[PDB]
Design a protein around this ligand. Structure first.
Ligand SMILES: Nc1ncnc2c1ncn2[C@@H]1O[C@H](COP(=O)(O)OP(=O)(O)O)[C@@H](O)[C@H]1O
Ligand SMILES: Nc1ncnc2c1ncn2[C@@H]1O[C@H](COP(=O)(O)OP(=O)(O)O)[C@@H](O)[C@H]1O
Ligand SMILES: Nc1ncnc2c1ncn2[C@@H]1O[C@H](COP(=O)(O)OP(=O)(O)O)[C@@H](O)[C@H]1O
Ligand SMILES: [Mg+2]
Ligand SMILES: [Mg+2]
Lengths: 48, 49, 432, 436, 48, 243
């Protein structure tokens, strides 16, 4: 590894950590809300 | 047959309601009506927890 | 922290304060006095809990400030959240979209809860491979943390999978009976480290256990909700917008029959509840006439009402009736009368309010405030509680004294003093 | 506000640290007791623990009830939701009156949300979907500070194709939502054709990845109307619904309760803060009996804001009733639920002080004798008339070549314009000629 | 047989430098709506 | 000064409406002058308060100046090949050939343009309008491509209606505005204040004239009492002959 740079790899691993944190926070945010009724309730209550 | 009415306005007017994404919050965290027909009670209550 | 529910006019009421014999305690669960009225409310509450008798009407009558809404809130709190309790005011039935009778019908059907219970077999797993030969026949591979199998697909299953754009790494559930596919999430791999994500994508763990699962869903809905659902093609949107309109009576009869069928099949249970209309005197004669025969149905909840009117004029007519309500409806209902409070009861209510608001007051301050409440009104004293607390905190005090109460009495006027001051300068005000 | 309004001089209640009212401060003159009461009310609003408390400002016209409410609003600041409404605004032709009242109640309650937003912005240098269907999209965005390669969720490819995003276009992508906006073509390609119907935009200056932590205030009504109708939707019913005229609807209490639950969840999470705020109802005597009866219930809610009423009526008939009179046009039951702040009439010295303050606010120089004449006119007719005489008199002074208002200008303006009393006297003197 | 005396196309909104995303979005919306609804409007051809 | 109100009162046939018309004439077309009768605020489409709000906001204008490139000339030759194309335009002083892009090719195809037509093109939008044929309007004289300064005075009501919904500008012509939400109006007021602070626009306060104001009811008068107190309120002029 003659051309290895420590600063570039530190930046890249910081970017990877930030990306993983963003993925976690977005996955938590996009499934936080629960439906008022839900598909099962609406399907049960919907007559032909 | 008549030509239509060409109503001319300032270009800045069409951007009056536009807000940059860095200046507004995500309103999808309060989207309850969007979950209807797409999200089930199973997903919210049994699977995700 | 500050939650959306804050200290209101009835935050101190947690129940009716009764024992097992429905005998009211002098001060229990935030209620003081009104022993006879609280006992009557408890009897009505037992009637509600039994659920056998339909369309029972009770009117809570009394002078303003005598605890009618307090008793109604105590009944609502004592009644479980399982049993519906629709609290509306009389003015809310005057709508520009639906008639008064339609509004009252919707409130009645909002007061009956239907608890549904559906058990459904599902397939739940993560998609490994989707192969389609040619949109005719294909195979789908699903896996869990403990299982993996392959399925042969037909035309409709392939079409449904292509419509939902199901691909590898997606965690989906498929209903065996109907074939509908809903996507729960997608699994996370090293190659799925996205920099930007869509508004609906979310990463979930691969399900464990067995690929075939049973889904049991129990929810409580009202008759009005089922009516709105079955009113139009996407009627559930009106459950948010409120643009219901006037639902056809045939739809309501069909839904009543279907609910009876569910109740017989064991798939649903009926929980009749309470409709509380506060300040009913705002209802017109037509609304009273409709209420007369609406209570006679077998799907009518308990109707609790509250008025503070004496012998007054019925709205929409020129006739005088004892509560503003025509005597035909009054013969259909039991009247619970509230008596004015005594000095001891007023002081106890002031103490409960101070404890609720976390205000410390001296005994001399309590005596002065009770005297003010008897002289002017109980609500004026209750407001002065917070006013004096704020003034005391302003002067860096810790306990409200008589000086603070006198200061806020001078700063804020009750109705009598304001009326006197207006009469002093009557010509200044407009349209006397 | 570049233009000068009626209450442009009101900056606050003018109280001191002890809560006592200074004689003249923050643009307010006199009304010491009312100002101290409004200070107590401001302290009540700041202590967020009380809900549904109501206040009435009762007094003769022109005594400063609206000015006191605006002073309360200034004391609270722009961070606290102050919703001003007029009593006659509840007579809508789309929704019932109680719906208007509840909508305003929810407008007064505010929610503060702290959030960090991430946007990838720049010119597109490469747009390559990676097939396994599409596993992911690799995009290349360029700015003045460099180039960045991004891996996109495959759901964003549909948005990119809908927005017609090609190489050389300047776009931004929202990290949290995947929304793509193509904001024109890069101006480096402006010479690729001699005549195209394109909007050419400069290359963004900062980094491709932009992070901003923002605090935005929303009200419960915003979330209610956001959940009243669906948004987007590729179905035929959704598209045809986009063409339907937007009409206000009676939002259900079920939706209100669910939104309250969501708000409590986010408050518990710690990303939201509640600001209860104030709803100001002016000309409350224009509400009818149904509105007042609904207010009886609404004020008793544990979710309601602080409501301030104002009335100048004396013993007058309630609007919806036949012959029922009440002290302020307000039923005695609602008057039992409010704390009344009384405003008094102004002395000549107070009128002169207010006239001087208005002159300073309007950028008008007035001489001592002119000020005394204006004060005498205000004593004779009305404070509002004297305040309204300043600008025309200043205009006459400017036309005549003088930079200050003299007494002759005020006399000329008083001759040119009439007040209510003089016009009423003329009308009574000429009843036959005027229309009945 | 009744024909309107005058026939005009809808009024058009013109700005010198409009947001470059509004017009393509409207065009796509119109195209999708036409592709979904025009076949369903064929029975009214003789009336039109 | 904002929200100043003046009443012209006098016997019938004493020049009240004449005075109002002279005031309107003395002001130019630049300053808005909304003239309505008291009866006009009674509508089945909206409330009285909404009608008066639209009357007020029609009286305040937002003057925005922007620069555009306008190409006006006579078409000489148009060539389109399977997309690439060329366009040749001439004036009485110069002639030019343009290399066309895809969007301009589509715009010229949608609006049939043939040799000899005199057309003007807005470069940024492709807005092509044929103003006649020459071999009837004389061919333009000077430069083919001109940079023009276009000034628009847009009322607050127009901004609200345009931004109320998609294709919402149609309501400026067909009524159908409904009752515009107060949130949209507050957002528009904030954006107009931002424009004024940033120099992007100038505010032109105007005049609302309500002839025969005695037809208004107590609710409308109560609304006017506080609507005049806003900083965006125009000057209100009313006329009545009632004793
Ligand atoms: N028995 C009681 N115990 C405790 N508080 C009471 C009682 N009766 C009345 N109050 C209080 O008095 C206030 C007014 O009474 P309420 O029942 O709300 O209205 P009304 O009885 O006049 O219809 C309420 O804030 C309530 O908390
Ligand atoms: N105490 C005061 N100090 C300064 N200005 C005042 C005061 N009272 C009234 N004004 C001014 O007089 C005008 C009319 O008063 P207003 O607020 O309309 O009284 P009300 O609300 O009782 O009718 C307002 O523009 C207000 O700015
Ligand atoms: N001072 C005047 N100078 C010129 N024309 C006038 C004058 N007064 C009235 N008129 C004309 O005579 C007619 C009288 O109408 P007008 O006086 O405006 O009625 P109103 O009293 O309802 O305002 C109008 O056509 C007006 O143009
Ligand atoms: Mg009550
Ligand atoms: Mg006239």
């Amino acid at each position: 590894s003659p051309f290895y740079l420590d600063s570039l790899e530190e930046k890249r691993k910081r970017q990877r950590s930030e990306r993983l944190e963003r993925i976690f926070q977005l996955s938590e945010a996009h499934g936080a809300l629960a439906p008022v009724y839900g598909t099962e309730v609406l399907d049960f209550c919907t007559l032909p | 047959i008549t030509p239509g009415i060409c109503f001319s306005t300032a270009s800045l007017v069409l951007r009056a309601t536009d807000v940059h994404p860095l200046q507004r919050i995500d309103m999808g965290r309060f989207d309850l009506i969007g979950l209807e027909g797409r999200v089930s009670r199973y997903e919210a209550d049994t699977f995700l927890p | 922290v500050t939650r959306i529910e804050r200290i209101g006019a009835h935050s101190h009421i947690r129940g009716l304060g009764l024992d097992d014999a429905l005998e009211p305690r002098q001060a229990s669960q935030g209620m003081v006095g009104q022993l006879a009225a609280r006992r009557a409310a408890g009897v009505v509450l037992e009637m509600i809990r039994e659920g056998k008798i339909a369309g029972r009407a009770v009117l809570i009558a009394g002078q303003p400030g005598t605890g009618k809404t307090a008793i109604a809130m105590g009944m609502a709190q004592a009644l479980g959240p399982d049993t519906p309790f629709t609290a509306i005011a009389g003015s809310e039935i005057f709508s520009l979209e639906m008639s008064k009778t339609e509004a009252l019908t919707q409130a009645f059907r909002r007061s009956i809860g239907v608890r549904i219970k559906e058990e459904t077999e599902i397939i739940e797993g993560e998609v490994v491979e989707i192969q389609i030969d040619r949109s005719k026949v294909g195979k789908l591979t699903l896996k869990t943390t403990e299982m993996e199998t392959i399925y042969d697909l037909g035309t409709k299953m392939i079409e449904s999978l292509t419509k939902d754009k199901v691909q590898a790494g997606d965690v989906i559930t498929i209903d065996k009976a109907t074939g509908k596919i809903s996507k729960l999430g997608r699994s996370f791999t090293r190659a799925r480290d996205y920099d930007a994500m869509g508004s609906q994508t979310k990463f979930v763990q691969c399900p464990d256990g067995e690929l075939q699962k049973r889904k049991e869903v129990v929810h409580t809905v009202s008759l009005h909700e089922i009516d709105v659902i079955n009113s139009r093609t996407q009627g559930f949107l009106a459950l948010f917008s409120g643009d219901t309109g006037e639902i056809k009576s045939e739809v309501r009869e069909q839904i009543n029959a279907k609910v009876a069928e569910w109740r017989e099949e064991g798939k649903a249970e009926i929980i009749p509840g309470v409709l509380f209309i506060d300040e009913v005197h705002m209802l017109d004669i037509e609304s009273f006439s409709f209420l007369n025969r609406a209570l006679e149905s077998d799907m009518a909840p308990v109707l609790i009402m509250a008025t503070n009117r004496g012998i007054t004029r019925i709205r929409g007519t020129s006739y005088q009736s004892p509560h503003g309500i025509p005597i035909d409806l009054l013969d259909r209902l039991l009247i619970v009368s509230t008596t004015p409070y005594s000095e001891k009861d007023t002081k106890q209510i002031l103490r409960i309010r101070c404890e609720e608001e976390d205000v410390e007051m001296s005994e001399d301050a309590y005596t002065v405030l009770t005297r003010i409440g008897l002289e002017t009104s109980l609500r004026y004293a209750i407001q002065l509680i917070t006013a004096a607390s704020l003034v005391c905190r302003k002067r860096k005090g810790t306990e409200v004294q008589v000086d603070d109460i006198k200061r806020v009495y001078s700063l804020f006027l009750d109705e009598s003093r304001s009326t006197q001051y207006m009469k002093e300068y009557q010509d200044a005000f407009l349209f006397n | 506000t570049q233009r000068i309004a009626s209450h442009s001089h009101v900056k606050g209640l003018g109280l001191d640290e002890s809560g006592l009212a200074k004689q003249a401060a923050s643009g307010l003159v006199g009304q010491e007791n009312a100002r101290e009461a409004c200070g107590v009310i401001v302290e009540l609003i700041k202590s967020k623990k009380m809900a549904g408390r109501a206040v009435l400002l009762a007094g003769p016209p022109g005594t400063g009830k609206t000015a006191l409410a605006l002073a309360i609003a200034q004391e609270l600041g722009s961070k606290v939701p102050f919703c001003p409404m007029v009593g006659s605004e509840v007579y809508s032709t789309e929704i019932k009156k109680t719906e208007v009242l509840m909508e305003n109640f929810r407008r007064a309650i505010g929610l503060r949300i702290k959030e960090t937003k991430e946007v990838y912005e720049g010119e597109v240098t490469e747009l390559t979907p990676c097939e396994t269907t599409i596993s992911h999209v690799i995009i290349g965005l360029k700015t003045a500070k460099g180039t960045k390669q991004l891996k996109l969720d495959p759901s964003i490819f549909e948005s990119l194709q809908k927005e017609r995003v090609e190489a050389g276009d300047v776009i931004y992508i929202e990290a949290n939502s995947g929304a793509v906006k193509r904001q024109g073509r890069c101006d480096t390609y402006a010479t690729e054709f001699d005549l195209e119907a394109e909007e050419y935009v400069p290359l963004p200056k900062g980094d491709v990845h932009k992070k901003k932590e923002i605090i935005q205030d929303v009200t419960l009504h915003d979330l209610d109307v956001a959940n009243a109708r669906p948004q987007g939707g590729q179905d035929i019913l959704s598209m045809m619904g986009q063409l339907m005229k937007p009409k206000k609807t009676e939002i259900t209490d079920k939706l209100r309760g669910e939104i309250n639950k969501v708000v409590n969840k986010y408050i518990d999470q710690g990303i939201a803060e509640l600001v209860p705020g104030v709803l100001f109802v002016d000309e409350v005597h224009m509400l009818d009996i149904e509105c007042f009866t609904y207010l009886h219930r609404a004020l008793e809610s544990s979710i309601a804001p602080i409501v301030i009423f104002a009335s100048n009526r004396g013993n007058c008939v309630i609007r919806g009733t036949e012959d029922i009179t009440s002290p302020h046009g307000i039923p005695l039951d609602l008057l039992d639920r409010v704390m009344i702040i009384r405003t008094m009439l102004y002395t000549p010295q107070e009128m002169k002080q207010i006239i001087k303050i208005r002159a300073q606010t309007e950028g008008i120089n007035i001489s001592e004798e002119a000020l005394n004449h204006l004060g005498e006119i205000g004593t004779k007719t009305t404070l509002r008339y004297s305040v309204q005489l300043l600008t025309p008199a200043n205009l006459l002074a400017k036309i005549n070549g003088k930079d200050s208002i003299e007494k002759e200008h005020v006399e000329e303006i008083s001759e040119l314009f009439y007040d209510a009393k003089s016009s009423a006297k003329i009308l009574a003197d000429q009843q036959d000629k005027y229309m009945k | 047989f009744v024909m309107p005396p005058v026939e005009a196309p809808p009024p058009s909104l013109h700005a010198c430098h409009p947001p470059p995303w509004l017009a393509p979005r409207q065009a796509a919306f119109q195209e999708q709506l036409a592709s979904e609804l025009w076949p369903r409007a064929r029975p009214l051809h003789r009336i039109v």
